[PDB]
């Protein structure tokens, strides 16, 4: 490779004209509009670009060595928290190490396993996703046992399609290589197609389940009910709104069997309607009477549980950091009260009801999760896992006398803690399982939180992870991760590949809690959203400058990475930041054409985050931010490796194709390589790639960064 040898890329004379509130009518040239399409020309272009990318990566001998390291780092047993079904047996996911999909196990005995004995020694295979297709192409995207434990509904995604299909099987009929070989697949006849952007919500009678489907872009979503032991033609439409075709739907059923809840969403903002229907014992039928409790888009509402007509709801109504309210439905005009009040400086992230009347709450304080147990009277009884530092979730069923916590972070691979209400008061909390890694020692790695100041004076926290031998003396390379949007928190997470990269090169890993995320609630999201979106980039750029300025990383040795909205983040950041701010950039499946994002698949919902390009006022703040339309001819770009999957239906690969073509046109003689790596396996909706393929891709990405920053293997 040398500068100025990029593929021949035709520049059309397509021009789109937009309305600007300040500038009037603005003609915007789109010479790579043709890269929106699926044609022979585009096939030649993607082939040429991918061959050029692979050719450059072939020059790097260290990539093969990293693949060896990363495979070994991933090669360890992994497992979920177990779930007790009403048959008395415990079910959990188990991965041997490098399986592309984890396998659902079932306990041999109707008792909580001693998991130190080993998963195969304490359980048998119930459901193996890997055998859904002989070639491993079929992926289980989600699943749900019935309340009574008799059936197992599971959504399957195929390669090629943009929809999942729900199948149902008896829990006494396992899916494995043995069962497939010995007999017939073993599932029921039920085949519920066109399932998307949803979960499976069983009614508490275990007779059927609620699911969202689309008609045979995606519009006119329907909330439907499927009865077990029937075909999809017999499925009841529970709710649809042809007047608002862009709206989507969710659902929930109360544990007592009394209520059916309907959620309605108009866009990707955290605002939903909430209607409540009373079920009589024969269950969901057509003609459900909806009580319109929340009937305007104003706040977030998610049901926790109910006791009689008193409904407990996690909400951010007049409470940016979230809280728990009660709405008493016995009243004609329902009275709204705070059960657990808003904490000013901690986001209420999750609340589950446990042992019928208690509440387990997860608070996120300075982007670090804290777990508490509350009584029925709203009294904070105790803090659980007080010395834990990372991200946490709850796993339980309301009626049972236990719950679990799944705990992880930058150097906590996976701890599963159990709380048992039946034990003596001092002995209730315990550790069920701790995840054991391979080669790495998590104790060799330190994570700290440091604060830096953005351009506007706002103070922003940032996680810094390093191998403990690495010094903050202005010599280390840095890898800066970000997402920056949609109230998605950039939480701590265990990555054996990242830690392996840090130990190998003595680099550091950085995660600034930039505005746009939901680390500090609604106001933090509002601070990097729509007209304020530029703050997200300023926060992210300031983070990188702070790392160099304060001697965490060496000058020009900050690489940046991000996926999807994180791709937009990195692509916009290289365009906007000063020359030499970054030493490498890796956008993965990113948004980039912010003038046309809303024209493709489910992009129209993201107007909540980016604004509407068709509105003149909003065009005026989108246009200057759009990465595709702000590339210059006078700024040296860092070494860039763009990655996309050609079958990506979430973010059309269009976005990345236009950006790389625009980069290559504007700075053809850039001293650093501007490449795009294009995977041509049409990966289905809600899938990982194969494990070996992930390892290879990781080795490419991290090797490219290593070489771009001039890092050698010791």
């Amino acid at each position: 490779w040398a500068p100025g040898n990029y593929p021949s890329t035709r520049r059309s004379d397509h021009v789109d004209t937009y309305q600007s509130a300040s500038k009037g009518e603005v003609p915007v040239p789109d010479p790579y509009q043709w890269l929106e399409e699926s044609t022979d020309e585009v096939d030649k272009w993607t082939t040429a670009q991918a061959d050029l990318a692979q050719s450059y990566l072939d020059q790097n001998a260290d990539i093969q060595k990293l693949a060896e390291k990363f495979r070994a780092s991933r090669n360890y047993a992994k497992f979920s928290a177990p779930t007790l079904l009403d048959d008395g047996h415990w079910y959990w996911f188990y991965n041997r190490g490098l399986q592309s999909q984890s396998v659902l196990y079932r306990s041999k005995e109707p008792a909580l396993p001693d998991f130190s004995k080993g998963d195969d020694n304490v359980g048998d295979v119930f459901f193996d996703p890997n055998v859904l297709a002989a070639d491993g192409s079929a992926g289980m995207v989600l699943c749900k046992f019935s309340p009574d434990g008799k059936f197992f509904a599971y959504a399957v995604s195929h390669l090629g399609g943009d929809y999942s299909t729900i199948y149902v099987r008896s829990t006494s009929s396992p899916l494995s290589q043995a069962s497939v070989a010995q007999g017939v697949d073993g599932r029921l006849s039920d085949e519920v197609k066109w399932f998307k952007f949803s979960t499976i919500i069983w009614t508490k009678d275990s007779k059927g389940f609620l699911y969202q489907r689309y008609p045979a872009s995606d519009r006119n979503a329907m909330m439907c009910y499927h009865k077990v032991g029937t075909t999809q033609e017999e499925d009841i439409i529970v709710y649809q709104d042809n007047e608002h075709p862009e709206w989507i739907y969710g659902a929930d059923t109360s544990e007592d069997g009394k209520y059916l809840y309907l959620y309605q969403f108009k866009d990707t903002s955290k605002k939903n309607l909430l209607w409540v229907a009373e079920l009589d014992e024969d269950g969901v039928k057509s003609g459900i009477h909806w009580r319109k409790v929340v009937n305007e888009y104003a706040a977030d509402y998610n049901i926790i549980t109910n006791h009689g007509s008193l409904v407990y709801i996690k909400t951010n109504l007049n409470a940016p950091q979230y809280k728990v309210i009660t709405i008493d439905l016995s009243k004609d005009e329902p009275e709204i009260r705070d059960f657990i009040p808003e904490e000013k400086d901690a986001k209420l992230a999750q609340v589950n009801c446990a042992n019928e009347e208690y509440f387990v709450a997860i608070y996120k304080r300075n982007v670090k999760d804290e777990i508490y147990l509350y009584s029925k009277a709203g009294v904070q009884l105790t803090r659980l896992a007080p010395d834990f530092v990372g991200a946490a979730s709850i796993a339980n069923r309301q009626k049972q006398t236990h719950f679990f916590l799944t705990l992880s972070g930058f150097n906590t691979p996976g701890t599963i803690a159990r709380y048992d209400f039946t034990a003596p008061e001092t002995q209730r909390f315990s550790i069920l399982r701790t995840t054991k890694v391979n080669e790495l020692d998590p104790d060799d790695f330190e994570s700290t939180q440091v604060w830096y100041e953005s351009k506007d004076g706002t103070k922003i926290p940032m996680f810094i992870v390093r191998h403990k031998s690495t010094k903050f003396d202005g010599t280390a390379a840095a890898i800066q991760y970000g997402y920056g949007g949609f109230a998605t928190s950039a939480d701590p997470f265990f990555s054996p590949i990242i830690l392996t990269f840090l130990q190998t090169y003595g680099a550091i890993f950085a995660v600034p809690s930039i505005r746009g995320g939901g680390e500090f609630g609604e106001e933090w999201h509002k601070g990097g959203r729509r007209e304020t979106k530029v703050n997200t980039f300023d926060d992210f750029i300031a983070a990188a400058q702070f790392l160099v300025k304060n001697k965490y990383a060496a000058p020009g040795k900050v690489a940046i990475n991000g996926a999807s909205n994180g791709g937009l983040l990195v692509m916009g950041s290289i365009v906007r930041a000063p020359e030499g701010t970054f030493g490498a950039a890796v956008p993965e499946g990113g948004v980039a054409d912010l003038l046309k994002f809303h024209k493709f698949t489910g992009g129209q919902a993201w107007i909540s985050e980016y604004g509407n390009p068709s509105i003149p006022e909003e065009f005026d703040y989108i246009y200057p931010l759009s990465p595709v339309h702000n590339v210059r001819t006078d700024k040296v770009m860092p070494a860039t490796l763009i990655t996309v999957n050609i079958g990506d239906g979430r973010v059309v690969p269009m976005h990345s194709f236009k950006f790389i073509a625009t980069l290559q046109h504007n700075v053809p003689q850039n001293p650093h390589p501007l490449l795009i790596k294009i995977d041509k396996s049409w990966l289905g909706a809600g899938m990982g790639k194969p494990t070996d393929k992930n390892v290879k891709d990781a080795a490419d990405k991290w090797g490219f960064i290593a070489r771009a920053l001039g890092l050698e293997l010791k």
């Binding site: 959990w92 952007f197 949803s198 989507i248 903002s269 796993a395 995840t435 994180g566 891709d697």
Partner: peptide, 30 residues
């Protein structure tokens, strides 16, 4: 589970290194 979060521009159900979601996969299966 978050219905509205399943259609975000995000990697998988926030980074490429989140590849393994086995730890949390058994949290809400019933």
């Amino acid at each position: 589970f978050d219905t509205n979060a399943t259609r975000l521009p995000i990697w998988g159900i926030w980074t490429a290194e989140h590849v393994d979601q086995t730890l949390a996969s058994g949290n809400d299966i019933c």
